[PDB]
Amino acid sequence: PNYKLTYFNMRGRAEIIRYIFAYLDIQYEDHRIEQADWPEIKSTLPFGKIPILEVDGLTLHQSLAIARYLTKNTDLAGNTEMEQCHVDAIVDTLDDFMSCFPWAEKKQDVKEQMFNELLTYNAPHLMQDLDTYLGGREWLIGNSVTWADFYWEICSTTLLVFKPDLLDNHPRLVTLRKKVQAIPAVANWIKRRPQTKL
Amino acid sequence: PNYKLTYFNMRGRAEIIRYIFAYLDIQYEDHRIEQADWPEIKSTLPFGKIPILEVDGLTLHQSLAIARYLTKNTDLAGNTEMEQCHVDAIVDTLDDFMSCFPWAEKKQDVKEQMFNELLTYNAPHLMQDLDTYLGGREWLIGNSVTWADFYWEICSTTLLVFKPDLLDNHPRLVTLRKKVQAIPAVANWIKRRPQTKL
Ligand SMILES: CCOC(=O)N1CCN(C(=O)Nc2sc3nc4n(c(=O)c3c2C)CC[C@H](C)CC4)CC1
Ligand SMILES: N[C@@H](CCC(=O)N[C@@H](CS)C(=O)NCC(=O)O)C(=O)O
Ligand SMILES: N[C@@H](CCC(=O)N[C@@H](CS)C(=O)NCC(=O)O)C(=O)O
Ligand SMILES: [Mg+2]
């Protein structure tokens, strides 16, 4: 296929797609726009949002819908229909929390206050639920890595920028991050990708 | 399979699962809890949110994860992987918008002003995008109904409570809603289901 991913120059909501392409060793065009390109770009998005992925001339949208598309019938999918449901559910639990953050808030004081409140009063309950769910298992779902593990690593990377102590009570969740980071194709992408805050 | 769905007494985030069960003629326990009963139940749940679906004693969570699990291998799925991606993406687009509303906000003037800003400024852009996406086609994806069409009818039902003029400029979106409503198994469920606001 010919693949063209359009997003900002940020990890953000495109990074899960970028991990998948790295892991599966699939070539793609990583098209990164500047704010100044936005109005022109937006005018041809189906729902006014990025990322989009063009696949042989047809446009897909929604980062997690695209991630699911790319991982079907690969080793990154759940190994059974039930596990596939659990992959989807963990991803949506993570994504729900990430969606609470006011990423585009222009009032910096207002934005910071909310970030800090979410990270102090809400994040610990999620981190605890994730730790309890993971227990002593190697990966979140099944006996091998899935794209839910990738999404945990991407989301927690973002959150650690703003709350360095996020995982001080959850060494098992740190171990999982490090395991994802050590997968050779992922490690290589992490080393070479453009360095951005988010 | 022995299915038990747990949610509040309302359509909310369980309603998609309820339509899928009705369309597929799958029997299930439609368990609706009181607010008073919730705290005790919430403590037994890995992520402390509803809906959950118990399948032969195994607990699934995340409404759309569950919906996808139920519709795989059925005629409510898209007919290619790419069309499955389109289904997933439309549903996430609608879910992102519904999730913008502060349904549980206790500060009532901040809730009110948020609702009115989303309805006045955000909703019309989304309706225009959905209308353009549908064009003159019969269903949102492919040549037959999918669960994306159900989710459109469900989401729009709640939006129309708060914004009765939502679809005044989008008759094709009204036509779609009515087509879903006319599907006999869906019609029967809509007739019979508990009458609730949300
Ligand atoms: C996978 C977990 O997600 C993240 O890590 N992301 C961090 C970066 N986040 C982010 O920066 N979001 C942005 S960056 C951004 N920039 C523009 N606006 C926006 O709506 C946004 C939004 C929603 C759109 C409108 C114009 C172009 C102003 C700035 C997305 C969440
Ligand atoms: N759930 C969607 C969210 C898409 C989204 O909101 N993207 C943001 C940038 S990360 C955007 O395009 N914002 C433009 C706007 O809100 O007007 C996804 O994962 O693709
Ligand atoms: N995206 C999730 C959202 C789940 C969710 O937040 N559910 C709410 C009610 S609609 C809940 O359980 N709230 C009560 C609580 O947090 O204790 C889904 O679709 O299942
Ligand atoms: Mg979502």
Q: Are strands A58-61 and A52-55 parallel, antiparallel or unpaired?
A: antiparallel
Selected catalytic residue, list A3, A69, A103, A139: A103
DSSP SS3 for B178:
helix
| Token pair recorded at residue A126 | 């999620």
Report the C-alpha gap between B198 and B192 in whole angstroms: 16
Whether the bond between A51 and the residue before it is cis, its omega within 30 degrees of 0, is yes
Judge if the beta carbon of residue B78 lies within 6 A of ligand 3.
no
Query: CA of B191 to nearest chain A CA: how many angstroms apart?
Result: 30
| CB-based contact A16:A69 (threshold 8 Å) | no
Phi, psi angles (nearest 5°) of residue B121: -110, -40
Radius of gyration for the alpha carbons in chain A, expressed in angstroms and rounded: 17
Strands A3-8 and A52-55: antiparallel
- As a whole number of angstroms, the distance between CA B154 and CA B196 comes to 13
Of A55, A58, A89, which has the smallest distance from its Cβ to B61's Cβ? A89
* CATH number of the domain residue A21 falls in: 3.40.30.10
Instruction: Please identify which residue in the block is written with the tokens 């606001």.
Output: B197
In this structure, the answer to whether residues B100 and B139 fall within a common structural domain is: yes
- Strands (DSSP E) contained in chain B are 3-8, 29-33, 52-55, 58-61
Burial state string for A96-132 with b = 16 or more CB within 10 A and e = fewer than 16: ebeeebeeeeeeeeeeeeebeebbeeebeebbebbbe
Beta-carbon neighbour count of residue B67 at 10 Å?
A: 27
Q: For residue B42, give the ligand 3 atom closest to its CA.
A: 17
Chain B residues within 8 angstroms (CB to CB) of chain A: 46-48, 55, 58, 60-62, 64-66, 68-69, 72, 81-82, 84-86, 88-89, 92-93, 96, 99, 125-126, 129, 133
Instruction: Looking at the structure, tell me whether residues A79 and A110 fall in a common domain.
Output: yes
Same domain? A137 vs A165: yes
Helix (H, G, I), strand (E, B) or coil at A66: helix
Q: Can you tell me whether residue A30 is helix, strand or coil?
A: strand
Are B1 and B59 part of one and the same domain? yes
Torsion region of A195: left, alpha or beta (phi above 0 gives left; psi -120 to 50 gives alpha): beta
Q: Is the CB of A178 under 6 A from ligand 2?
A: no
Q: How many whole angstroms separate alpha carbon A75 and alpha carbon B118?
A: 40
- β-sheet bridge partners, residue B31: B6
Residue B43 shares a structural domain with residue B94: no
Based on the fold, state whether residues B90 and B161 are members of the same structural domain: yes
Torsion from C-alpha of A139, A140, A143, A144, nearest 10 degrees: -60
Regarding whether A167 and A192 lie in a shared domain, the answer is no
Q: How far apart are the first and last CA of chain A?
A: 29
Read off the amino acid at residue B141.
Answer: I
Q: Do A67 and A83 have their domain in common?
A: no
* B194 and B170 co-located in one domain: no
- The 10 Å Cβ neighbour count of residue A182 is 10
**Closest residue in chain A to residue B132, using alpha carbons only:** A46
Q: CA-to-CA distance for B168 and B188, rounded, in angstroms?
A: 27
Is residue B180 a contact partner of residue B20, using CB atoms and an 8 Å limit?
A: no
What is the distance of C-alpha A144 from the center of its chain?
A: 18
Instruction: Return the bridge partners of B6, or none.
Output: B31, B52
From the alpha carbon of A10, which atom of ligand 2 is closest? 10
DSSP string, A84-122: HHHHHHHHHHHHHHHTTS-TT-S-HHHHHHHHHHIIIII
- Angstrom distance (rounded) from CA A27 to CA A29: 7
Q: Is A103 in the pocket of ligand 1 (CB under 6 A)?
A: yes
DSSP helix/strand/coil, A21: helix
Gyration radius (Cα) of chain B, Å: 17
Among A125, A70, A133, which residue's Cα sits nearest to residue A100?
A125
Q: Is the CB of A166 under 6 A from ligand 2?
A: no
DSSP B73: T
Judge contact between A123 and A147, C-beta under 8 A.
no
* Protein residue whose Cα sits closest to atom 14 of ligand 3: B49
Long-range contacts of A183-188 (CB under 8 A, 24+ apart): A183/A23, A183/A145, A185/A22, A185/A23, A185/A25, A186/A19, A186/A22, A186/A23, A186/A150, A188/A22
Phi, psi (degrees; rounded to nearest 5) at B67: -60, -45
**Are the CB atoms for A5 and A53 separated by under 8 Å?**
yes
* Structural domain harbouring A191: 1-74+183-198
Cα(A79) to ligand 2 centroid in Å equals: 30
A84 in the same domain as A35:
no
Burial B71-110 (b: 16+ CB within 10 A, else e): beeeebbbeeeebbbbbbbbbbbbbebbeebeeeeeeeee
Here the CATH number for the domain that contains residue B167 is: 1.20.1050.10
A60 shares its domain with A129: no
Domains of chain A: total? 2
- HSE-up (13 A, CA, CB side) for residue B40: 5
Q: In whole angstroms, give the CA distance from residue B88 to residue B153.
A: 15
d(C-alpha A151, C-alpha A153), whole Å: 5
Question: Residues A138-173, buried b or exposed e (16+ Cβ, 10 A)?
Answer: ebbbbeebbbbbbbbbbbbbbbeeebeebbeebeeb
The dihedral formed by the CA atoms of A168, A177, A131 and B58, expressed in degrees to the nearest 10: 170
DSSP characters over B3-35:
EEEEEESSSTTTHHHHHHHHHTT---EEEEE-G
Widest CA span in chain B: 49
Specify whether B68 is located in the same domain as B95: no
What is d(CA A57, CA A60) in angstroms, rounded to the nearest whole number? 10
| Residue position matching structure tokens 């607010």 | B35
User: Look-up: residue for tokens 């399948």?
Assistant: B55
B49 labelled binding-site residue: yes
